[PDB]
Amino acid sequence: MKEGIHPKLVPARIICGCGNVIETYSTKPEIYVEVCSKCHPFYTGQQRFVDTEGRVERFQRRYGDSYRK
Amino acid sequence: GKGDRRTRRGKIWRGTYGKYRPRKK
Amino acid sequence: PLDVALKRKYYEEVRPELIRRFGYQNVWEVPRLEKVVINQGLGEAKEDARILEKAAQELALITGQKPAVTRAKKSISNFKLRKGMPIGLRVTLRRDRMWIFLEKLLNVALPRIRDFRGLNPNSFDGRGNYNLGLREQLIFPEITYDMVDALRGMDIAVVTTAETDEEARALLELLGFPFRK
Amino acid sequence: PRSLKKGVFVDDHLLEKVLELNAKGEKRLIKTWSRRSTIVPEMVGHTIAVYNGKQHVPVYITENMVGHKLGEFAPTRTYRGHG
Amino acid sequence: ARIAGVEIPRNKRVDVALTYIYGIGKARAKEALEKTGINPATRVKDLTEAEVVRLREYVENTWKLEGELRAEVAANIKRLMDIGCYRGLRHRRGLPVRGQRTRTNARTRKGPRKTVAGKK
RNA sequence: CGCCUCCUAAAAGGUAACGGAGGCGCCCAAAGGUCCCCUCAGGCGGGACGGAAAUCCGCCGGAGAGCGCAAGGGUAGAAGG
RNA sequence: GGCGACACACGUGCUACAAUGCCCACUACAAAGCGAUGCCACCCGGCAACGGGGAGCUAAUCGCAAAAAGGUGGGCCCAGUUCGGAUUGGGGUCUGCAACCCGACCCCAUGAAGCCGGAAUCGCUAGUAAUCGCGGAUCAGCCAUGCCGCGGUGAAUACG
Ligand SMILES: [Mg+2]
Ligand SMILES: [Mg+2]
Ligand SMILES: [Mg+2]
Ligand SMILES: [Mg+2]
Ligand SMILES: [Mg+2]
Ligand SMILES: [Mg+2]
Ligand SMILES: [Mg+2]
Ligand SMILES: [Mg+2]
Ligand SMILES: [Zn+2]
């Protein structure tokens, strides 16, 4: 490349919120992070993350069918 | 906060009770 | 030569799977990931060359190699841009420096896009290549939020030796790109 | 709103006709002078006309409109712009 | 800390710094600190990182916020749209909804006073 | 009213009219010498702030770009960058 | 259905623009009125509106009813910032046959404009100005920040 102007690439170990140790060579020797390829909800299964709701309960608001038959 | 529903004297001004001004001694 | 993970992940996961799915008969008929390009287009640097050096330092911090300017080729009346006036900052990525950047991107930076609903799989040119753009630079773990100044973001051009769009689709998906279905 | 200790749709005027037309099919238009009708989810797929003060507005029904009343789909005021 | 997606709090006393999160107020933050077991009166300069991780795996999981509370509210507005609903048409014309006086000032909802030529 | 470019100009040169159309009376120490390197304008798709074109990515494009300035000749196997 | 419509304009009021300030926990100090189709002590359930029981009261003996500012302690560190709440979504309480174009409340989260207001203009000469809360009328409920009374702390100035 060109010498003296380009940065140097050092071993970089990224620690995650779940404790994942990511194994790269980069421009800072130890990295803190808060996500990885596993904690992001789109990556792995999506596991009814926060919703458990098909919609708001439009056709499900009945809460007891109480009328005259 | 005489109009704020989530402070003390807003509940005192309208005379309504709840979390932010309960009546208990 | 280096023990970068996505290169070996390519060779042992995505390289035979693309032979299996499409029926390749030569080892170089597989799609190959070469010449990742970043142009970080700073059209807001018409009046200032001092933001350009900080953006060059940040780009050299996140990819390991220092970008070049892009000189304007053609002046316009609406947007000042006379002859020169450097308002761009282009860097291309090769030879284990695209791979560490793709590790950074796919594992850290893309989950730090806000709500990150997926990608656009319709963003294919027709001849095996792909382009995407980033909004903020704080998604990369090398950007520190206390050495930052401004809301400077990115356009990434990734090139593949694939002939069609469906080949690069399966190469990007299996190597770790989070497209929408 | 209506208290959840009690029910909803206290109008036996409209319930009889909509349940008879549910059991019969043949999705015929019914004209009702009752905006206080909170729409039962059995009313999905019927042409209901609500009288808003001058005229009836024909209201097609799909699955999404349940807790809304029928006057929430019946405008009683026409403005058309300041100028 | 680096807790609510990428929009972060810092700087002096989490018990009001959690209130800056879109979807985390004061009493919800009090519930979050009561179940986690952390000091309200401590500050975010000086705390254990395990407290941070436990606060994260509390708050970004047990409620919805970050970049989808805005999506839920916008989808609820579009739910009110497109059908002929009254409050959706009030949201359409830029007009207030919850039984308001619009003869005089509704300029919270309407915008600035668009002062007109005012005949007679 | 002097000079330059095309036509009138009848395929060498030349050729008039108060004939048809345009300019020039400057500039460049880099817009010169040499050496080395690069090839345009557009069109089709793709891409944060980018819209018909601020910058980039892939394909087609023998010269329609450019060559300071009017026009002509010429030119990418360079005189262009 | 309308008197609540709204691109605007005017008058009268409420809440603020903060540190003589805000929030939280505890602790005091009144006056004037109201109520057996009602006022509800006190328990249980709910973070809460409130609900289920049920004592008392024809009421200077019962209840409304905590009065607030005040006082003690702690937190906020002056930044559109736990000042300020507009506005908006969801979930609930009471009334009324019915609360959507038209209610009042409770909870969550959004949390705006406003960091002292141009020409001008208003009230006040002693408990008066200012500030703070309470009760009545109507009223099934209530848009009551309106009106009428009640009391707590308590200025400044008036050469002419
Ligand atoms: Mg070397
Ligand atoms: Mg928030
Ligand atoms: Mg000749
Ligand atoms: Mg001749
Ligand atoms: Mg001339
Ligand atoms: Mg394009
Ligand atoms: Mg020329
Ligand atoms: Mg009126
Ligand atoms: Zn993780």
Side-chain angles (χ1 to χ4, degrees):
Chain A
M1 293 177 69
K2 287 173 74 70
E3 187 177 1
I5 182 168
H6 291 284
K8 293 172 71 175
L9 278 301
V10 298
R13 273 74 184 268
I14 305 100
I15 59 169
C16 182
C18 71
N20 193 2
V21 177
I22 305 167
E23 193 75 24
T24 195
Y25 295 167
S26 173
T27 60
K28 179 180 176 182
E30 186 174 0
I31 304 294
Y32 296 164
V33 85
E34 58 270 14
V35 289
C36 70
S37 179
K38 188 179 289 293
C39 290
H40 184 74
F42 183 75
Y43 287 159
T44 304
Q46 295 93 23
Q47 291 182 358
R48 55 176 61 88
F49 166 71
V50 73
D51 50 357
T52 185
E53 293 288 327
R55 298 290 187 270
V56 69
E57 290 181 354
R58 294 286 88 195
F59 40 81
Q60 293 172 357
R61 88 297 179 276
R62 55 179 65 87
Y63 278 94
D65 290 330
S66 295
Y67 67 97
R68 301 303 300 161
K69 273 78 68 178
Chain B
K2 290 184 175 68
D4 186 74
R5 299 290 181 90
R6 296 179 183 177
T7 56
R8 187 265 304 274
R9 62 190 67 188
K11 300 289 284 293
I12 294 295
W13 184 64
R14 283 183 171 92
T16 59
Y17 287 163
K19 183 186 263 79
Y20 302 99
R21 182 69 269 168
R23 198 274 306 158
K24 189 176 186 293
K25 297 293 186 290
Chain C
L2 280 71
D3 197 2
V4 56
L6 291 181
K7 186 176 180 180
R8 288 177 62 249
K9 185 174 178 181
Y10 168 75
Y11 281 105
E12 77 187 0
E13 177 179 358
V14 183
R15 190 176 182 87
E17 192 72 23
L18 266 293
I19 298 169
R20 183 190 66 83
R21 186 176 294 112
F22 289 167
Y24 290 158
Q25 295 295 321
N26 195 359
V27 71
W28 291 93
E29 287 182 354
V30 302
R32 295 185 298 274
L33 191 62
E34 62 93 21
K35 192 183 180 180
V36 177
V37 180
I38 295 170
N39 204 152
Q40 196 268 330
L42 291 172
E44 60 190 1
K46 295 183 290 294
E47 64 185 1
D48 199 4
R50 185 175 60 192
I51 303 298
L52 187 62
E53 67 180 2
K54 175 59 71 71
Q57 290 177 357
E58 292 179 355
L59 288 178
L61 187 64
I62 62 169
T63 196
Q65 59 185 355
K66 193 176 265 77
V69 300
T70 72
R71 187 179 180 272
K73 65 183 75 174
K74 177 64 162 56
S75 57
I76 309 296
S77 95
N78 329 264
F79 352 129
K80 246 335 245 255
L81 221 225
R82 295 158 104 312
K83 259 358 296 156
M85 195 173 288
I87 59 157
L89 193 59
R90 185 264 314 278
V91 58
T92 61
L93 282 71
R94 286 182 178 90
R95 300 289 292 166
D96 296 330
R97 288 183 291 272
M98 68 171 77
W99 296 98
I100 57 169
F101 181 78
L102 286 174
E103 290 185 355
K104 294 165 183 62
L105 183 64
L106 296 173
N107 293 318
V108 167
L110 290 178
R112 295 285 80 188
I113 302 297
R114 306 183 191 276
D115 184 1
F116 193 60
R117 296 178 182 92
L119 269 301
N120 194 1
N122 203 3
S123 172
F124 286 161
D125 56 352
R127 291 174 180 88
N129 296 316
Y130 176 64
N131 297 316
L132 75 159
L134 298 174
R135 195 261 180 274
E136 70 268 17
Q137 78 277 21
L138 289 171
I139 56 172
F140 294 101
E142 294 85 14
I143 305 299
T144 62
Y145 183 74
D146 57 356
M147 292 297 291
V148 301
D149 183 73
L151 57 156
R152 59 184 72 89
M154 194 178 297
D155 291 329
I156 297 171
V158 57
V159 178
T160 305
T161 66
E163 292 177 352
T164 63
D165 293 331
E166 298 88 4
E167 302 176 354
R169 180 67 176 87
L171 183 136
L172 295 177
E173 171 65 28
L174 294 170
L175 193 60
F177 276 89
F179 289 97
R180 195 180 68 248
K181 187 184 265 79
Chain D
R2 187 76 65 86
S3 295
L4 272 299
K5 66 179 179 181
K6 65 180 73 67
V8 74
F9 189 75
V10 282
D11 277 324
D12 205 3
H13 315 287
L14 316 183
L15 189 146
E16 291 181 353
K17 298 295 185 290
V18 72
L19 266 295
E20 286 178 354
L21 196 66
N22 192 3
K24 191 176 180 180
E26 291 294 326
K27 303 176 289 293
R28 190 178 178 180
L29 195 147
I30 49 170
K31 292 181 175 66
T32 61
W33 295 265
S34 176
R35 299 175 69 88
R36 49 188 287 169
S37 62
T38 301
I39 179 162
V40 177
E42 295 177 353
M43 293 178 68
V44 174
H46 288 285
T47 61
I48 183 66
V50 182
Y51 180 74
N52 59 5
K54 186 178 179 180
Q55 61 185 356
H56 294 89
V57 47
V59 180
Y60 285 93
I61 306 299
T62 181
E63 300 89 4
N64 58 9
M65 50 189 77
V66 279
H68 307 87
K69 291 184 181 292
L70 268 65
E72 189 71 24
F73 290 96
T76 66
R77 292 172 185 170
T78 305
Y79 187 73
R80 293 194 299 266
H82 60 278
Chain E
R2 310 301 296 268
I3 55 170
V6 193
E7 298 295 327
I8 60 169
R10 190 60 71 189
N11 203 4
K12 303 289 102 176
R13 290 283 298 273
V14 287
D15 57 353
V16 299
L18 292 172
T19 65
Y20 297 101
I21 302 167
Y22 186 89
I24 303 297
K26 184 175 288 293
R28 177 168 285 177
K30 292 297 181 183
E31 173 67 29
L33 56 83
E34 282 177 354
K35 196 265 186 179
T36 305
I38 59 170
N39 193 1
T42 194
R43 299 178 187 271
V44 75
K45 188 261 181 182
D46 49 355
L47 85 169
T48 306
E49 76 274 14
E51 298 173 353
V52 174
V53 175
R54 287 184 290 116
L55 192 150
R56 288 175 68 251
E57 69 187 0
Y58 195 88
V59 301
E60 73 187 0
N61 295 114
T62 190
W63 306 284
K64 62 194 294 183
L65 295 174
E66 240 0 84
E68 67 180 0
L69 187 59
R70 296 175 196 273
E72 185 185 5
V73 172
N76 209 163
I77 300 304
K78 188 182 183 295
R79 166 73 200 90
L80 297 176
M81 292 293 175
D82 199 74
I83 60 172
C85 183
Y86 175 75
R87 59 192 289 169
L89 289 175
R90 303 292 289 169
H91 287 163
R92 189 178 303 280
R93 293 181 181 178
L95 295 176
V97 176
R98 294 180 182 177
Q100 302 295 323
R101 180 177 173 88
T102 63
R103 181 178 176 93
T104 63
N105 46 4
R107 279 91 181 94
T108 296
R109 181 71 180 173
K110 191 180 290 184
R113 290 185 291 113
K114 300 175 184 178
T115 300
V116 78
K119 293 182 176 67
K120 269 66 184 298

